[PDB]
């Protein structure tokens, strides 16, 4: 409901598949037409176009476009063609490269996805790679960090209940302070337990009730009590629970603020959150960093790649 790319009203899968077939078979490849079409269609509509294209040409659209395109634009388009679950699962599999695992992407995806999304992701992952996500998480992670990632990826977080339990909120804040800053050392399993099991609004009110018992807020308490992968995961998780659009705005900023561009993160965010809360991310981004997201994307990317990302953004703020 808060996505930037909406379902195209006057949609016709057959003509889109025709125009795309034409744009592909065009000499020198017509990237502009492909971008113009795919970036203004909903994911489901893109699936419809894929099916129509398949019936028309008896070749799958993703293959033809992987042949017709290259580089970052290829990455973006092939990212858009997949269903949300498929894309997330594929990114997760890509992030797990043994001991040199990209833990940043892994954290980004596992910490920010909801119960339904994770439930679908586990199934699709198992169907795609004939192996449960948990086995690979265990294989490519270790320790309390592993435990946390496994807990989160199980996707059985409690749902937001009818009634607000302020008492349990208070007791959770107390438990968090007692297991963290109060004692020397850290009771990590209790932290993981509370942060993975309780619902999101409950954990918001808990995170702000924690400010009453502790001299440091939740983020700083994390920066002090634990460090490393565990720390990064806890930080990202808390950022997501508190303010997810702001979190993704910060993640977008971090991907472009420095030298070059962390295109994996940029592309993944602009694709996965295009039909979710891209409007809110734009809002938070301009509210915090002065200029629009469109602007940063414009200054840090060029060409039809830039064009695609700008279409996924949806105008200047
Ligand atoms: Ca290629
Ligand atoms: Ca301590
Ligand atoms: Ca840059």
Curated annotation (Swiss-Prot):
Record Pfam families: Annexin
GO biological process, one term: positive regulation of vesicle fusion
Crosslink position(s): Glycyl lysine isopeptide (Lys-Gly) (interchain with G-Cter in SUMO2): 27
SMART domains for the chain: ANX
Residue numbers of Phosphotyrosine PTMs: 2, 177
UniProt modification remark: Phosphorylation of Tyr-2 enhances heat stress-induced translocation to the cell surface. ISGylated.
A GO term for molecular function: protease binding
Residue positions where N6-acetyllysine is found in the record: 27, 130, 205
A Gene Ontology cellular-component term: nuclear matrix
Keywords in alphabetical order: Acetylation, Annexin, Basement membrane, Calcium, Calcium/phospholipid-binding, Extracellular matrix, Host-virus interaction, Isopeptide bond, Phosphoprotein, Repeat, RNA-binding, Secreted, Ubl conjugation
InterPro entries associated with the record: Annexin, Annexin_repeat, Annexin_repeat_CS, Annexin_sf, ANX2
Localization in the cell: Secreted, Extracellular space, Extracellular matrix, Basement membrane; Melanosome
Cross-link Glycyl lysine isopeptide (Lys-Gly) (interchain with G-Cter in SUMO1) mapped to chain: 27
UniProt key word Secreted: yes
Intervals holding Annexin repeats: 11-82, 83-154, 167-239, 243-314
Sites bearing Phosphoserine, chain numbering: 4, 162
Top-level taxon: Eukaryota
Remaining remarks: It may cross-link plasma membrane phospholipids with actin and the cytoskeleton and be involved with exocytosis.
Similarity annotation: Belongs to the annexin family.
Function summary: Calcium-regulated membrane-binding protein whose affinity for calcium is greatly enhanced by anionic phospholipids. It binds two calcium ions with high affinity. May be involved in heat-stress response. Inhibits PCSK9-enhanced LDLR degradation, probably reduces PCSK9 protein levels via a translational mechanism but also competes with LDLR for binding with PCSK9. Binds to endosomes damaged by phagocytosis of particulate wear debris and participates in endosomal membrane stabilization, thereby limiting NLRP3 inflammasome activation. (Microbial infection) Binds M.pneumoniae CARDS toxin, probably serves as one receptor for this pathogen. When ANXA2 is down-regulated by siRNA, less toxin binds to human cells and less vacuolization (a symptom of M.pneumoniae infection) is seen.
Noted disease: Increased expression of ANXA2 is associated with hepatocellular carcinoma tumor progression.
Quaternary structure and partners: Heterotetramer containing 2 light chains of S100A10/p11 and 2 heavy chains of ANXA2/p36. Interacts with ATP1B1. Interacts with DYSF. Interacts with COCH. Interacts (via repeat Annexin 1) with PCSK9 (via the C-terminal domain); the interaction inhibits the degradation of LDLR. Interacts with CEACAM1 (via the cytoplasmic domain); this interaction is regulated by phosphorylation of CEACAM1. Interacts with APPL2 and APPL1; targets APPL2 to endosomes and acting in parallel to RAB5A. Interacts with S100A4. May interact with UBAP2.
UniProt comment concerning the protein's domains: A pair of annexin repeats may form one binding site for calcium and phospholipid.
Name this polypeptide is given: Annexin A2
Gene encoding the protein: ANXA2
